[PDB]
Amino acid sequence: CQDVVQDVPNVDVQMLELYDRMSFKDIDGGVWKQGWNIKYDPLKYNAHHKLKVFVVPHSHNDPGWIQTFEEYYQHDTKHILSNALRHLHDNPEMKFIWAEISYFARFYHDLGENKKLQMKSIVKNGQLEFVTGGWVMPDEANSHWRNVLLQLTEGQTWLKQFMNVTPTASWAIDPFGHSPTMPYILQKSGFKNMLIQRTHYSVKKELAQQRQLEFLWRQIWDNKGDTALFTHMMPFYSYDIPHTCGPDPKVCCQFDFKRMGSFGLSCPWKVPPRTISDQNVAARSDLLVDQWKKKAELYRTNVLLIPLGDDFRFKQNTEWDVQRVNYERLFEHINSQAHFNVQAQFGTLQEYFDAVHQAERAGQAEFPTLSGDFFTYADRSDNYWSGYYTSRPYHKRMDRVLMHYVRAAEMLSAWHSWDGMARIEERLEQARRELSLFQHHDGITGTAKTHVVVDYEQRMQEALKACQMVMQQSVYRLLTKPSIYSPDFSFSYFTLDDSRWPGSGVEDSRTTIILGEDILPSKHVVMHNTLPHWREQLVDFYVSSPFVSVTDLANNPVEAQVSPVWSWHHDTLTKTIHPQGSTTKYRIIFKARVPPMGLATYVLTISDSKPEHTSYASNLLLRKNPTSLPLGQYPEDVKFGDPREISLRVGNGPTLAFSEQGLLKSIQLTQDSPHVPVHFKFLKYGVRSHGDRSGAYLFLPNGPASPVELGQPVVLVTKGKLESSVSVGLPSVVHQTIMRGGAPEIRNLVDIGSLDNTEIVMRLETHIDSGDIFYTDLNGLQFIKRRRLDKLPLQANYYPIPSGMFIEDANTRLTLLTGQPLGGSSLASGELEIMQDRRLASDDERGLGQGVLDNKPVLHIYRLVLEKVNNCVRPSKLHPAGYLTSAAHKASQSLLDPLDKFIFAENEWIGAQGQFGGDHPSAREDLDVSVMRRLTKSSAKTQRVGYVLHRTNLMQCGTPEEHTQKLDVCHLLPNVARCERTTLTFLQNLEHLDGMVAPEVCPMETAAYVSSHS
């Protein structure tokens, strides 16, 4: 295995190093506003060395933005695809590329057979070409790699089944900045080339001057270069026609033939296109070839890519004709005028890349190597697109909940083959497609109109219900004696209980387990662990009595803690935010221990008085002017006091000290150790009163954040043997620190209410000497080193925090793991900060046409890990990556893939069993089975199950960390007949494996395997 820590890769362009050297000056470059006046030598191209130009028609189709998916499909996309089929069928030389398979599948399934056959023929013969082939063209900042792979696989599996093609070239013209997680996944999915567009204008200028816009993009830790994927970065401000022919938009706009008037479009540079005729073709070709030769100066081969398209283009027949006929007149003239030394034609994206690599193999060009990312994007001036790292945070959090539910549903149901009447494949396909749709660059980004956001939310809610159905049917099958199992596939045997979604204070969605001497003495509950190692985690359930005890199914007592159910209220009468306790619902908490990829059953039983193995939390309300808080049968009375500093310790774990306002002020790791200053603070950013306004995309603060005025907030302290917590009602946020014996969990119930033009940030202040360095993750896959640059404005130093961030010095590290993608930064040495929500009254002029005024309460979750790192083997100072410790990685897993909880729905479960998966191997902690998916329906003689295996890389810090078992996914199901390593989408077999054994993968690698069973 390659060492991903100790060897700094030698690359021609390393983005962090480039960033440190670049000046980022925004100078007026002339007609190329963010470049320079390009010059070329007319003698470069001659009879024996022509410029080959590929004009590639395209249509950018968003699966929701200003309209919903279905609205756009009915108003625009179905007409574009119908007319593309007719026009390409009738004009053999015309070409077209298509990226969004969610729309193509929605169209193709509605076509009659004659037209399906016509469509298959224009794909087979190369006229219509699929680029990327994902369900969507995903956001690259907030998306988790697991969901980027899910949506790629959904679209490519559809393409292989119905079109018999698998794209090897990717097209990403609109995501707002670009992540190296894309070439990572694409190169492991058979790709050979990719194209990107939205990178900082200063980066385009810098790379264009060096002819480094085409490069072999490798991962930041890849010393050898095996992850490299050829990448083409487009050079200009947009993918529209004015910005794709060459450097001067006033000229290029005249070659967008849809802008002459009858289509309601025009050129803002005030020179319109004119129909090509024999009298003007020479002058028009002179202008166009000059633009092309200038664009060609920025690249190394004699093959030039000229995209021809824009949003929802090629809709009308008349548009297809106006673009095609005018370009064909230009080609016939240009290609016959020897003096131009150009051969131009319509082409596809793969045709362009194939010709570029032909030139490379002929020794005509060599390409530079590059590592790093392309965040944070700015399209002009100081307009950095860091706002969408936080916009619509409720749905960003929902994405991560559904991510996990889809993984758990596919894994739980994969163990068996199901009859078609069970509708398992139907519900899983629905769930995968709704989560895949939301990866769109106007979905998870929070950049769609309000009614479109509602549509995505509705689709994800249906997907969660589908996952629940499949999971609970699977648990019933896996834990019931087979000769007793009697499924009704529409019945609810179990209901899921989720303590953090939508979350306390967001929705009352959780069911209370109702026990009583005159109704039901006990209830079975089951936990599922999707991770491939044995795992313990505290779990909680609501119960109708505080006198409840827990047992396992061998009837062994399990230690439990009962706490009250506390709900916070913004009291419009007293004008305080304070908690109310239930006098009939209680929380019971206990430690569940679950096998790798397995299930464990427990029983909750009521008694008439305090059970021997259940303890009760104390509760202390700190506030001026308290009033009583009765809790019914709960056996400890609530205590009261004036606000004061407090300290708590659970188990052996850290001791946390809190200010009188209920906010952390220090962490002491052990009895002997220093109380390390770690302070939480909430602040607010505002908006500029003149000039550009913040909106869904842009973060344009009116200076550094100001502290939220806290008043004298009400603080609630709950102290228990298994779990303790401090919660405080602050303006717009109920902030909660929970202790269970290890790193604390932080929960914020964020309700920005009616605070217009405000962004609420949570900051951590420490004395760690981090300087200008901090680390953030990319897509939950890798941590990249960031350097705060004071030559850039505050908003440019914000980066996506899809799953975690950290700061460190020689001795100490503070890592904040997140359960949802949000924006964040380290704006000063020793600080970390992460945005919670933002409410903006103005539109930011990128086309959305609204501010963000649709906020709703959201429960954000985190883990906060303070550690000594002086003993850890870390990368050298020049390495661009960082790596988590074991405790931080486990804390991230606790947020993203918690245990699932099921409550048996009827009175008695006949045939119940105690555990499933006790014989599953418990794999080393850095290995995960990211995906387990049965790939065949029950009628297939040979069953196939696919697995995606990912190994992260954890720092070595001196812990022996020892005995685990090798995980061979091909032997997890019986009767294995074959084991193959495949691409990550499962669509191509790459290696037949000896002994039907699937080897584990190397650190930072991901592999896929398919086992076949007879």
Ligand SMILES: *[C@@H]1O[C@H](CO)[C@@H](O)[C@H](O)[C@H]1NC(C)=O
């Ligand atoms: C699918 O494509 C392959 C080549 O890529 C071809 O050999 C095979 O016949 C095709 N199957 C069809 C036409 O469905």
Ligand SMILES: O[C@H]1[C@H]2[C@H](O)CCCN2C[C@H]1O
């Ligand atoms: O995705 C839509 C929109 C983005 O939301 C912001 C950049 C311009 N894009 C055009 C549309 O495709």
Ligand SMILES: [Zn+2]
């Ligand atoms: Zn778009």
